């Protein structure tokens, strides 16, 4: 009682520090009387307009704890004054009160939401001023996001005002309206969703302008993303209209409708089954769409590549058709001029291979084409393009253990080139070594015998790199190389004498360092054990010391 009065008196001290500390003390007390509550509430509202900024910040942060403790009636007039302050002419008051309403909604019972939405609905419709529309839309989206299922009675009222805004000249209004629509659909009744979908379809059927069709297609994509299963029953009418729109000359319009297809393919799998063939055909036909260059429209190629990935990653039961029709296209499109599209097509084909884990014979039939494309693609200067080829090879070998038996002569120089290139970074070297390890592990030893002379020097050089991550992979590869040069379970006519010293000398330095990391030591011990086990006889006086 007496303590609060002194703070209330010091909040008008006409000095910055006293006001700051009084507000801080009140905020601390609230976190840890009927007549006193009203005075505190009025003072916080008055401090919202203080000249100093720190006092304003404290006043805003005080609104959070304040509403929890004080009675419900006071919250009503707090909401009233903040909502009134939004529509005030002063520019700074709107901004300072918007944060207050967002905090009040965050730290929040059912009556205050009804009080807020009444003002918000009228505020959104004001076509003359755009700032009020933007902030009101943000606040309403926040209100619907959290504790938005309570306002069951106001859903038609909210939707009656949002739909006009989708034709606003300002593009920000449309973008902020779509989010509010999605959050509304996230939790609403069945009657309102039918009206929304019917309105969108009716608007699309009578296309007034190019910019309008884009907005409704984006709205359909967003509602499909959030609602998901609820829109599956209406796909039978959505798909044919969007397919007809996809043929329009506008480059931008194509990307949005392809993304719309992707949402239907991914979010709702059951209802989209009949139209998968049409979606795949459209994506394939637009995957090669470059209307300028022959051997500003890379967005449509990216969209097609991503939609193909979405289709492949979900439908397990379509592998025979996949390797029949989509596999040759992606392999043929490994020569994309833009790096971004090439990454997308590589990711799509990797998704296909991961799904493949009969498909196997079809994949083995297509292996030569993959090798032919990758042979050209491994000579590129860019690190990122080369880095995807190794991830391609690793997955291909993992799915089919003996896939690359016939192409080692053409695949080895590509790895060797990346291993000793100066421009190559650490990530490229690590991936190349990892690919080489997997290739060596999953193939017969007799294949690599001609190429041991080529493989040994770069690997030995990679064991001595200053970065220890490369050294660990080099030691791991050296172990398998030791197993390959002289296997102990099968007869071999290969002569391994020249490379014995080359491997031993590089391994022993890492074995006896006493300053290297844990991983390098733990791999050096393992590699030296294998060296001794397989080729220890040729070692001379070094073995007793080792």
């Amino acid at each position: 009682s007496y303590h609060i009065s002194n703070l209330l008196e010091k909040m008008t001290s006409s000095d910055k520090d006293f006001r700051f500390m009084a507000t801080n003390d009140l905020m601390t007390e609230l976190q840890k009387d009927d007549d006193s509550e009203r005075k505190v509430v009025k003072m916080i509202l008055k401090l919202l307009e203080d000249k100093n900024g720190e006092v304003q910040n404290l006043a805003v942060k005080c609104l959070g704890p304040l509403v929890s403790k004080v009675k419900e009636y006071q919250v009503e007039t707090i909401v009233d004054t903040l909502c009134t302050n939004m529509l005030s002419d002063k520019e700074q008051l709107r901004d300072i009160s918007s944060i207050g309403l967002k905090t009040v909604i965050g730290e929040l019972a059912a009556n205050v939401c009804k009080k807020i939405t009444g003002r918000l609905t009228s505020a959104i419709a004001k076509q003359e001023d755009v700032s009020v529309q933007l902030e009101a839309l943000d606040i309403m989206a926040d209100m619907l996001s959290r504790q938005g299922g309570l306002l069951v009675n106001f859903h038609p009222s909210i939707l009656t005002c949002l739909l006009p805004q989708l034709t606003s000249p300002r593009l920000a209004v449309r973008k902020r309206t779509i989010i509010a629509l999605g959050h509304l659909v996230m939790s609403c009744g069945n009657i309102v969703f039918v009206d929304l979908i019917e309105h969108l379809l009716s608007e699309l059927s009578k296309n007034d302008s190019m910019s309008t069709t884009r907005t409704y297609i984006q709205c359909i994509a967003a509602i499909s993303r959030q609602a998901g299963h609820r829109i599956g029953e209406y796909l039978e009418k959505i798909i044919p209209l969007v397919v007809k729109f996809c043929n329009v000359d506008d480059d931008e319009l194509r990307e949005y409708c392809i993304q719309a297809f992707e949402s239907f393919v991914r979010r709702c799998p059951k209802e989209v089954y009949p139209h998968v063939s049409t979606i795949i055909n459209i994506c394939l036909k637009y995957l090669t769409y470059d209307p300028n260059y022959n051997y500003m429209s890379w967005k449509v190629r990216r969209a097609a590549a991503k939609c193909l990935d979405a289709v492949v990653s979900t439908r397990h039961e379509m592998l025979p058709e996949f390797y029949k029709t989509v596999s040759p296209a992606l392999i043929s499109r490994f020569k994309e001029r833009e790096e971004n599209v090439k990454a997308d097509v590589f990711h799509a084909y990797l998704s296909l291979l991961k799904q493949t884990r009969t498909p196997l014979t079809m994949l083995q039939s297509q292996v030569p084409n993959i090798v032919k494309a990758l042979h050209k693609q491994m000579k590129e200067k860019s690190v990122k393009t080369r880095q995807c080829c190794f991830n391609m090879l690793t997955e291909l070998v993992n799915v089919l253990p003996g896939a690359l038996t016939q192409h080692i002569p053409v695949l080895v120089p590509g790895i060797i080139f990346s291993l000793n290139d100066k421009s190559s970074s650490s990530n490229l070297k690590i991936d190349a070594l990892s690919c080489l390890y997997v290739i060596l592990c999953n193939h017969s030893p007799q294949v690599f015998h001609p190429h041991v002379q080529a493989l040994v020097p770069p690997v030995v050089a990679c064991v001595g790199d200053p970065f220890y991550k490369i050294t660990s992979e080099a030691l791991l590869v050296t172990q398998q190389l030791v197993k390959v040069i002289r296997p102990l379970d099968q007869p071999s006519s290969f002569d391994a004498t020249p490379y014995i010293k080359d491997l031993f000398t590089c391994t022993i330095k890492r074995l006896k360092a006493a300053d290297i990391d844990q991983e390098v030591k733990e791999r050096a011990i393992s590699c030296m054990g294998q060296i001794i086990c397989n080729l220890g006889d040729n070692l001379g006086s070094d073995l007793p010391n080792t």
């Binding site: 520090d17 943000d138 650490s426």
Partner: protein, 497 residues
């Protein structure tokens, strides 16, 4: 074995409900859970790390489901996950190398990928439990502030600088909103946010002055997000710049309309008038304004004198740029250059050769900047005669052109970026001391007598949002206020009014 145990547990419930008494349900369940799970916790902990190394989400989910039935059995998994995420983040940053120190995009994207992968893993496999998201937050906060990049810079303030430099690259000249949201997600784990704020303001000033913004909607979106992230003072400090730009647009339009009354200007002229206090720019060096530009200077000075009598202007010649057209070349081409380059290029039109020492007096440009801009000119291959010699003569290289119709020779200076970063880093350090002094003054104002530890705690809890003060600097601030007579000692301090 997890599958087998999960099947056996359900079979036991079926059995006890079907043909036993209902009072055995608790005992049978407890005994079965014990013998099946609690005795193999060491093997489960060993398998957890291997499942983490080779990404196997369903196995991790089944392990979480099984071990969640044991009292205080989830503790070790949280620690293992925290250590794994911290090591993965450090390793991912380390593999980037020395390039991350000067490439914001790579550095930010690596952290974003590391965060996104394990956030998805926690949301999917661990059923979005509070304990696991706490471990993820701790690991992210650990490896964002301290990593290999910060060791090279010898300070933990490099991460906010790189984030602010990534935002500027994003916002310079549909999916952008998502990456901006990701940036705001990363910004939560930064200890030193004032470093981010100062750099963001300093680069937004450059974007606004030079008119090289992508779109105003993205700027508004960033302002809105920073409103929820940061406080209100910073937002108003940023809004003052936009208000000044808006005022300057109207002033320029009014001057353009009024200019037609007299003889029109021979050259296109636009002006950006900014308040000195709000904007971060500094005063220009001494300069001899070229004769070709004197009329526009005088006319605007006279006009702004009439519009506002009280105010006085202060021109900045290190941020003013223009366009030039040449007829002495093989083919007429228009080029874009700064005011200094114009002055040291319009100096000679018919004259072919000049000495750098001799030409210095005419332009009055300081030697340090003059040499550094001469390297920029010479590298453009438009001028010809690697250290400097004051007696060197520079002669125009006639008959030289470029493939493009127009050439932009306004290239950032080699050392300017490093000097700007160093100066900003020093200003941040000075501002920290000033804020600490102000906080101590306020605390002494409110409370007449206080102890050392209580004062330190109050300062730390007041300033914790922006940065974490060090203990020695607070004591140094107390000492400097001792000399300034704000407070005097009586381990206990007292305000002297």
């Amino acid at each position: 074995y997890m599958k087998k145990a999960e099947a056996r547990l359900l079979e036991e419930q079926r059995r006890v409900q079907v043909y036993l008494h209902e009072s055995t349900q608790d005992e049978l369940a407890r005994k079965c859970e014990q013998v099946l799970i609690e005795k193999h916790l060491e093997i489960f902990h060993t398998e957890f790390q291997n499942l983490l190394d080779a990404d196997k989400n369903e196995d991790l989910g089944r392990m979480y489901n099984l071990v969640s039935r044991i009292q205080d059995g989830l503790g070790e998994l949280k620690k293992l996950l925290e250590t794994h995420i911290h090591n993965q983040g450090l390793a991912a940053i380390e593999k980037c190398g020395e390039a991350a120190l000067n490439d914001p995009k790579m550095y930010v994207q690596t952290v974003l990928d590391v965060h996104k992968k394990y956030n998805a893993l926690v949301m999917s496999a661990f059923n979005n439990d509070a304990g696991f998201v706490a471990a993820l937050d701790k690991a992210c906060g650990r490896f964002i502030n301290n990593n290999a990049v910060t060791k090279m810079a010898q300070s933990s303030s490099k991460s906010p600088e790189l984030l602010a430099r990534y935002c500027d690259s994003l916002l310079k000249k549909a999916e952008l909103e998502d990456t901006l949201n990701q940036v705001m997600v990363v910004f939560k784990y930064i200890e030193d946010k004032d470093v981010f704020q100062k750099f963001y303001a300093k680069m937004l000033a450059k974007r606004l002055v030079h008119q090289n913004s992508a779109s105003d909607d993205a700027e508004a979106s960033m302002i809105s997000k920073l409103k929820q992230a940061c406080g209100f003072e910073y937002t108003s400090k940023l809004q003052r710049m936009f208000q000044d730009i808006g005022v300057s647009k109207d002033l320029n339009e009014q001057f353009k309309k009024h200019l037609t009354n007299s003889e029109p200007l021979d050259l296109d002229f636009s002006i950006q008038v900014l308040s000195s206090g709000s904007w971060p720019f500094q005063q220009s060096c001494t300069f001899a304004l070229p004769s070709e530009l004197e009329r526009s200077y005088q006319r605007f000075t006279a006009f702004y004198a009439s519009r506002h009598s009280g105010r006085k202007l202060t021109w900045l010649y290190q941020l003013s740029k223009g366009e030039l057209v040449t007829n002495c070349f093989k083919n007429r081409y228009t080029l874009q250059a700064s005011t200094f380059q114009m002055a040291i290029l319009l100096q000679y039109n018919t004259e072919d050769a000049y000495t750098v020492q001799q030409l210095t007096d005419s332009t009055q440009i300081k030697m340090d900047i003059l040499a550094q801009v001469l390297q920029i000119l010479l590298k453009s291959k438009l001028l010809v005669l690697v250290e400097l010699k004051p007696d060197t003569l520079i002669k125009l290289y006639l008959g030289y052109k470029n493939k493009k119709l127009r050439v932009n020779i306004n290239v950032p200076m080699k050392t300017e970026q490093k000097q700007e970063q160093e100066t900003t880093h020093k200003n941040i350090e000075e501002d920290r001391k000033l804020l600490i002094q102000a906080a101590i003054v306020r605390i002494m104002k409110m409370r007449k007598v206080l102890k050392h530890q209580q004062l330190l705690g109050e300062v730390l809890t007041q300033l914790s949002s922006r940065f974490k003060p060090r203990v020695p600097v607070i004591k140094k601030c107390i000492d400097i206020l001792i000399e300034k007579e704000y407070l005097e000692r009586v381990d206990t301090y007292s305000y002297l009014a």
